[PDB]
């Protein structure tokens, strides 16, 4: 260890040092705090170079204005800052915005290695597409997002073979709402303007709610709040959206100027939350270029703070944040507004709603030819072999193995012969890839690619299996209830579980959700039942007249007994509906075959022989949930099994809650009844032209 | 259509 160079007494700084995990991070915290304590970190007064008295505010907008052909069309530098798994949606958007005359510079979050490999294949095909060799971990609200933009601006200005006129930043959840031709016509007319949107409210309230008067430090992929600071004197501070369009002259100024304004603002915003939401506004309005500002970023942002402000980033930053919602089909009419010029919108998510994306793409660039496959489907990779089984969890690894075995048993039973069965397989190694599969915005299950030996010819084969969950929601004669579901990682903004498969292990903490229709207020009862009829929890909920979704995480002692749980909803003892979910036993511990003592410790129910303090044994007779002494002992025996016996217990559970819909081969096969994966409608190997990138057409487009 | 992602402490 090592003591600080200063006495540290601020509550925020002490709370940060206590929660920080690495020695390097604790040192950086102390160093930052000390320097600010002595007044050597933040500037207190900054020179203003703008001759105006206040803001500029420039222009009158007519739809026909953007239908001319420019003699000198601008060439655009697109900077794409992307993360996550949605490579095929990114490919579709890249297809919509591509033109051979523009330029594309793609920064992939350091933590998204799968996506980076897919982007690399794009940059290798096209000479006007490059990827940043440096990669940052751009957490939400982090100071590193500004460092990302400023470094990409320096890189782009030094690429003398790319003569660009405008800088436009986009994420993987953006999409154009007007053609490239109209974008170029508009910007070619206003090439000396800068497009930034301000908050549109009270400026004092903007500063407080953004935390601009607080000192932040990014370290260990977290934003630590370290105390207060003053807004420097002599300049107007402003901000709004961090999505903008800036012309080359202003980017040159920000990058290379050494005047008092740029130097001190780069220092100030190195320790600022959400810095890109106000750094560029503050510099521009106080700089010599202040009279070039248009208070319009040419974007439609789907803000719905009723749903998007749930302080959902509290584990990443020491502050409460918000974010915009995903568009749905009913929002299409908003893209046709004429009040102000707009060319892009956000956010779009294909795993949330793809229909609106299709509507928008065909509206801008026309339908695909009749007979085009995959237009209503979506595939998203959630595991890729090069990232290693340690990037998975014991839960997902266990279940992905089980799904593969479920497919191999499907192949064997699907061949009807009295001779040698040439569709019997023995599994080998670990899954090569896993995909989510959607059709018409309905989740279809998982696709698992895996290797196996065909035992008839004794040869290795590569296969893909489609597994789909069995329907388990059941309503009963009696109503406002529409659906009930159990899962983890509930997304309060989009109102869905981000653990799409509902994959759960004994150490997971399930969440119960209900979906309601309109009607008067009502109160219902919720019952959780474990695989041997033990009632784990009971509670009543009020369903207010305006309620649409409700959810609750019951406090259950761990581990949960493995098997099929049941959740019941009653109304004054009158049954309403029920649902089921699976707590799967694990065949892996630290990615290794589980050992007897850890199997027994993990699969024999909770420690205190009870899930909560209060008991509900008084309810088993009333609800007809008798506890069978034989099943209880059998569950004890199951809890001590390993190897084959454990594999047989898991696979019988999985088979009861999942169905192997189909299985295909990627290459040659000896099984006479299996299609080639490329010939199927469902395989991740089947044609998907809406997300495929080919040769540049005569008009310079890919779409 | 107000802008800004911060939502207080
Ligand atoms: C009207 C009805 O049938 N049930 C309840 C009612 O008892 C209660 O007073 C009211 C306000 O909480 O909400 C509703
Ligand atoms: Na390239």
Author numbering:
A (entry chain A): 252 to 310, 312 to 730, 735 to 959
B (entry chain B): 211 to 219
Q: How does the study describe this entry?
A:
XT1 and XT2 are type II transmembrane proteins consisting of a short amino-terminal region facing the cytosol, a single transmembrane helix, a stem region required for Golgi localization (Schön et al., 2006), a catalytic GT-A domain (Lairson et al., 2008, Müller et al., 2006), and a unique C-terminal domain of unknown function, termed “Xylo_C” in the Pfam database (Finn et al., 2008). XT1 has a two-lobed structure, with one lobe comprising the catalytic GT-A domain and the other comprising the Xylo_C domain. To better understand the initial step of GAG biosynthesis, we have determined crystal structures of human XT1 complexed with UDP-xylose and various PG-derived acceptor peptides.
To obtain defined complexes, we used crystal soaking to replace the co-purified ligand with dodecapeptides derived from the PGs bikunin and syndecan 1. Peptides 1 and its variants (2 to 7) are derived from bikunin. In this model, the serine OH group is perfectly positioned for nucleophilic attack on the UDP-xylose C1 carbon atom. When the XT1 complex with peptide 1 is compared with the C2GnT-L complex with the acceptor Gal-β1,3-GalNAc (Pak et al., 2006), the attacking oxygen atoms occupy the same position. Indeed, when we soaked XT1 crystals with UDP-xylose and catalytically active peptide 1, the electron density for the xylose group disappeared, presumably due to GT activity within the crystal (not shown). From our structures, we estimate that at least four residues either side of the serine need to be in an extended conformation to fit into the active-site cleft of XT1.
